């Protein structure tokens, strides 16, 4: 459901991401703050199942955002893995991994894990 | 099994954990950084499958360590989830989650994820 995924999504932390789902399974867009100021916009790229099951299952997808743009660099990257569920109350349920660039000594604490639920409202 | 799990294990990061596997699935012991140092010893408790399959599968187990003892407190807790594999090269392969006590605002970055492999040597 490329038509179902394409659009603006909001999470519970105050972040917004606009994405376009290509017919070829590509996901491209921008991840930004609620405000949308230029310094807080980051490129996002991912992939999704462009031919999901028809037994009522969700649509598997994932995307990545490296936290660097033309204004700032947080030397880290986050990947979201989850599935899109359509309907009147459509949502994208995800779990993410945030990895920071670290020295070998700090590699053990380089990755944070969490979960985000995105809605169209 | 019980006899296979009970004993001293070492990870690839310099930590040592001594555990005793009870007949009914209990795991009890100590997790320490350096021997002969009271300030680096912490209590560990967990559970394991005391009647694993006999098809060559590993033995599921998990344990927790709250990073507080009578000398220090890191206000955090780590849980290891994995399986014990017996043999000449016995080991415990795990994935862990380290959660720190945080304010509501920092809850999103409260949990670290990683993996440890423990060996008898």
């Amino acid at each position: 459901a490329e038509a179902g995924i394409t659009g603006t999504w909001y999470n519970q932390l105050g972040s917004t991401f606009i994405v376009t789902a290509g017919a070829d399974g590509a996901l491209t867009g921008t991840y930004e703050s609620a405000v949308g100021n230029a310094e807080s916009r980051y490129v996002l790229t991912g992939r999704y199942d462009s031919a999901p099951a028809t037994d009522g299952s969700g649509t598997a997808l994932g995307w990545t955002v490296a936290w660097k743009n033309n204004y700032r660099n947080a030397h880290s990257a986050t990947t979201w893995s989850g599935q899109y569920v359509g309907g009147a109350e459509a949502r994208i349920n995800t779990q993410w991994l945030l990895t920071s660039g670290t020295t070998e000594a700090n590699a053990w604490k380089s990755t944070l894990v969490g979960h985000d639920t995105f809605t169209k409202v | 099994a019980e006899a296979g799990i009970t004993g001293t294990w070492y990870n690839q990061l310099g930590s040592t954990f001594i555990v005793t596997a009870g007949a009914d699935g209990a795991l009890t012991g100590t997790y320490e950084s350096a021997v002969g140092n009271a300030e680096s010893r912490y209590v560990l408790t967990g559970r394991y499958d005391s009647a694993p399959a006999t098809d060559g599968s590993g033995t599921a187990l998990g344990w927790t360590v709250a990073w507080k003892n009578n000398y220090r407190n890191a206000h955090s807790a780590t849980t290891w989830s994995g399986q014990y594999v017996g043999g000449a090269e016995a080991r415990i392969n795990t994935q862990w989650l380290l959660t720190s006590g945080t304010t509501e605002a920092n809850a999103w970055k409260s949990t670290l994820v990683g993996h440890d492999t423990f060996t008898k040597v």
Partner: peptide
Amino acid sequence: RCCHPQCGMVEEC
């Protein structure tokens, strides 16, 4: 409060 882009950071800290 938020000092990382992921938690919706608007202004640098």
